[PDB]
């Protein structure tokens, strides 16, 4: 009988979360690196969407299965941030290991993460002013579309797609 004692039982989840976060952390922002994949039919695709890479890769772990839904819920409602949600979830778990070394009960650390998330979410209502000028806002929107297409899927940054 093989038993996983303490951090060993959680290490399975930590390693899986790092296995994905290692690719998500390199894809964040306009400077993110795209992920190229070859399908089972020999079809090469280029994506920077966390949901796509998690669904296209062969799932062999509970975390890898759950992370698919984690990113899918982001693009279905919001769009961008499919890689950021995974990185944040992995970081919370990575710090959870340190909390266990403090001797804090595994459930109590989970409770603290939920409480902190509630405050971090609500604090976003005050972060960033609600006054935007149409002319000043047009420029970052153009740059965002150019980096969204040109750094994630298409290496030639189609002028028509980003501008239209």
């Amino acid at each position: 009988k093989s038993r996983l004692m303490g951090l060993e039982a959680l290490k399975s989840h930590i390693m899986a979360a790092k296995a994905v976060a290692n690719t998500m952390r390199t894809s964040l922002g306009p400077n993110g690196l795209d992920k190229m994949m070859v399908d089972k039919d020999g079809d090469v695709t280029v994506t920077n969407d966390g949901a796509t890479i998690l669904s296209m890769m062969d799932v062999d772990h509970q975390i890898a299965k759950l992370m698919v839904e984690l990113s899918k819920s982001q693009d279905d409602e919001i769009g961008d941030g499919t890689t950021g949600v995974v990185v944040l979830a992995g970081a919370l778990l990575e710090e959870a290991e340190q909390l266990l070394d403090r001797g804090i009960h595994p459930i109590r650390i989970a409770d603290g993460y939920e409480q902190a998330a509630r405050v971090a979410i609500e604090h976003l209502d005050k972060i960033s002013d609600s006054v935007l000028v149409d002319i000043k806002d047009t420029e970052p929107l153009i740059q965002t579309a150019k980096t969204t297409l040109g750094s994630k899927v298409v290496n030639s940054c189609h002028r028509q797609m980003a501008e239209i």
């Binding site: 303490g6 951090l7 039982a9 266990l100 403090r102 001797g103 595994p106 409480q115 405050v119």
Partner: protein, 395 residues
């Protein structure tokens, strides 16, 4: 010649005190222990704005000491319904709350948490005068305290360590001499004698925090409950050394420990069940009784003769009859319930629990008096994010 266990012989011998035997005390108290729980009346006290009460002990026939989440130590005068606070002692250097309180076998030294949750503070009884400075032996908060002797005390911590503090004959003699001679008390400076960790078993080595301690005066054993699901037994007759470890049926919310001196059984709380441990039995031979309060957790446990009192997060106290192997029924399990006490609708409540106006006051501590007829109950709201207190005397 048969053994006489009847209370009739006790009554007729007590009137003359002609070598009246003490063997009748077991029946006297056990008989009352079955009938008392259903006849108790509630006497609620107002604790003011104290955060929570986590631990309590009987100091006199009229007063019970109580520890708090804010590190404030105080005594509830149940005879006059008055609240008296005790000054919080500082450490030797300026480097949570009080989760446990214990009295030495001689009832002369009170051990509670100090201003710093990682330090032990010592108070003098019955005067409440300070005895010693807060120590710095632990690197983390102290969650458990147990007096292994009249001069020695052991305190646990979140990191699984247990500090061993010993008062020498010279220190105790000078401390007592100063308190009786000088009207103004003078406290002594102390440090821990040794620091030992609980054994590392095949269970979670990280969740090694010691949440509860209990001392067996008959066998000089120090029991300890960890949150990794294992129970640890240490010898504390003269020095601190490990004896045995046993497996608990549940590894969740194992926060309370009590020892039945008449049964040689360690009672360990859990998320729902009370475990009955026997150091003489195999590590897997542990019985469990369900408190029926599933999902709320068992917060306190104690023995009154053969009746086990179990405090839960719903603010109720259950009574288990060891001889009958069942919970006592009300004259439908018999249970006491806490009052409203005081709830703090502070910013934390507003941020996390704004959808609920009132929470039941969980039973964090309870204790029987020397007669066994008065049961002090104290606690506060179950959620860790809320502040609020309750206390009352059942009689």
């Amino acid at each position: 010649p048969p053994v006489k266990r009847s209370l009739v012989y006790y009554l007729k011998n007590r009137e003359v005190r002609l070598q009246n035997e003490t063997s009748y005390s077991r029946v006297l108290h056990g008989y009352a222990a079955q009938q008392l729980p259903s006849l108790l009346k509630e006497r609620e006290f107002h604790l003011g704005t104290l955060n929570k009460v986590f631990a309590s002990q009987w100091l006199n026939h009229r007063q019970v000491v109580c520890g708090t989440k804010c590190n404030t130590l105080f005594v509830v005068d149940v005879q006059t319904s008055q609240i008296t606070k005790i000054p919080i002692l500082k450490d030797r250097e300026p480097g949570c709350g009080i989760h446990a309180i214990e009295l030495n076998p001689s009832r002369t030294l009170l051990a509670t948490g100090g201003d710093n949750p990682n330090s032990l503070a010592i108070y003098r009884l019955p005067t409440l005068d300070p005895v010693c400075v807060g120590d710095d032996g632990h690197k983390d908060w102290i969650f458990s305290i147990a007096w292994i002797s009249d001069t020695m005390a052991v305190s646990g911590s979140r990191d699984g360590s247990m500090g061993l503090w010993e008062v020498t004959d010279d220190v105790l003699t000078k401390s007592d001499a100063r308190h009786n001679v000088s009207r103004v008390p003078v406290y002594a400076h102390i440090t821990h004698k040794a620091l030992k960790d609980i054994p590392k078993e095949d269970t979670n080595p990280d969740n090694c925090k010691v949440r509860a301690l209990a001392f067996n005066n008959k066998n000089k054993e120090l029991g300890a409950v960890s949150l990794d699901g294992y129970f640890h037994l240490w010898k504390a007759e003269n020095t601190l050394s490990k004896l045995l470890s046993t497996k608990l049926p549940y590894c969740r919310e194992n926060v309370c420990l009590a020892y039945g001196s008449e049964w040689s059984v360690y009672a360990v709380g859990s998320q729902a069940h009370v475990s009955f441990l026997d150091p003489r039995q195999p590590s897997y031979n542990v019985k469990s009784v369900c408190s029926r309060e599933r999902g709320s957790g068992i917060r306190s446990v104690s023995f009154y003769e053969h009746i086990i009192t179990v405090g839960t997060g719903q603010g109720s106290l259950l009574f288990y009859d060891i001889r009958a192997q069942r919970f006592l029924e009300e004259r439908e399990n018999l249970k006491l319930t806490t009052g409203k006490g005081w709830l703090n609708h502070d910013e934390t409540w507003r941020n996390y629990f704004s959808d609920i106006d009132f929470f039941p006051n969980a039973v964090y501590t309870h204790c029987y008096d020397s007669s066994g007829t008065k049961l002090f109950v104290a606690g506060g709201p179950l959620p860790s994010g809320l502040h609020g207190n309750y206390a009352g005397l059942w009689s």
